[PDB]
């Protein structure tokens, strides 16, 4: 009965940024205008979210053995990890910008940057799972 509250919330933070990516990749494919704007909205929620507020004393896979899937791996100290955070935000706010600006190519390329950004993170914590 771990009941990881801090982690669980982080799970939500993953669904948030992960939502921007999803709505971003679909909008990226079958774009138009309405989808992009909506993705942007989800984006902003992620952008101004507060990444540094759910990534801390969690499970820590790399630390010691345990269930989980990924926790301590990440590969990048609190600083580097913090970086990817902001980086994701770079795509976050910039993608929403394209949404408003109506730059479908700007929102597609920007959101893809966030795509490889978040993805890159997971690619970092190449945990066992």
UniProtKB/Swiss-Prot annotation:
Maturation and modification: Binds 1 heme c group covalently per subunit.
InterPro entries: Cyt_c/b562, Cyt_c_II, Cyt_c_prime, Cyt_c_prime_subgr
Keywords annotated in UniProt: Electron transport, Heme, Iron, Metal-binding, Transport
Keyword Glycosyltransferase recorded: no
Pfam families listed in its UniProt record: Cytochrom_C_2
SUPFAM superfamilies (UniProt xref): Cytochromes (SSF47175)
Residues holding heme c: 10, 15, 68-69, 118, 121-122
GO cellular component term of the entry, any: periplasmic space
One annotated GO molecular function: electron transfer activity
GO biological-process terms attached to the record: electron transport chain
Job of this protein: Cytochrome c' is the most widely occurring bacterial c-type cytochrome. Cytochromes c' are high-spin proteins and the heme has no sixth ligand. Their exact function is not known.
This protein's name: Cytochrome c'
Source organism (scientific name): Rhodobacter capsulatus (Rhodopseudomonas capsulata)
